[PDB]
Amino acid sequence: MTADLKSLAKRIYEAYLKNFNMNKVKARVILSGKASNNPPFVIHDMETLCMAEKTLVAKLVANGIQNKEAEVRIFHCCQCTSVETVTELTEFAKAIPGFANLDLNDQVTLLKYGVYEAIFAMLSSVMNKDGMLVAYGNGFITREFLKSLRKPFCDIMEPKFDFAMKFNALELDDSDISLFVAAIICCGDRPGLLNVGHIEKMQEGIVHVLRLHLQSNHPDDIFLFPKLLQKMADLRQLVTEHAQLVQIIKKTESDAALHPLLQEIYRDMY
C-alpha cells in the first residue's frame, strides 16, 4: 500500500471526521461509561419518552407535532436526524475526489440510492444490543421500548439493530467506516446513471484503497474485505425493505408526515 493510497484514505477519514457530528470513537466512549459518571438519559417507556420530550418541546411545537401519537412523535424526531445525516453525507460526498466533477444528475442519483445504505451503516456505531444513542449521544432509547410500539412503528428499527449487531462484531473503526461509506456512495450500478464508466473508475479506486486499508489495519481478520462486500449487499436489501415499510406507513397512517427532503429521496426509488 503506497503513500498515495495511504493519503487518499487519510483524507477520506478527515472528511468524515469533519462532516459527521457523531462518530464511533465518541459513541463507544459514551456507551462504555468509562469517561464520565453522567450517562445519557434513558428513554425506555412512555413516561421517560414524555420526559425527554420536555427538552424537545421546541422541535415538536415547531411543526405542530406535540399532540400526535407517541409513535408519530418519535419518528418525526428520527426523520429530523435522517435529514441532518443526509445533509452531512452530501458535504462528505463533495470531498470524495472526483465526485464533484461528475454530472450533477449523477451526483443526485448516487446520493438518492446511497444515503440510506450509509445511514444504516453509520447508525451501527451508536447502537448496542440494548438500544441506540440519540440527540448527539445525550440520550439512549431502548431496543425493547421501540419493539413495544404499535405496528407498523415497532417494525422499523429492529431490523437495523439486527444488522448493527453483526456489523459491529467486525470491530471496524472510523478510518474503516469512512472508506466504506465512500464505497457505498461511489457505486456504479445505481439506476439512471448517465456516465457509468466514469463512476465505475471512481468506485474501483475507492474499493482498492478500502481493501488495502483493511489488510493493513486488520491484518488478523484476513477476509474482512469480502465480509464488508457482503455487508454492502445486505445494506442494499435492508434499504429496499425499509423503503417498502415507508410506503406502508404513507398509505395507512394518515397523521404521519414525511419530511420533504426524504420525500425526494424515496420517490420512485425501488
Partner: peptide
C-alpha cells in the same frame, strides 16, 4: 433533478 430540488440545491452550495 427537477424531482430532487432540495438535494439538487445542497449539491450546488
Amino acid at each position: 433533478t427537477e424531482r430532487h430540488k432540495i438535494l439538487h440545491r445542497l449539491l450546488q452550495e
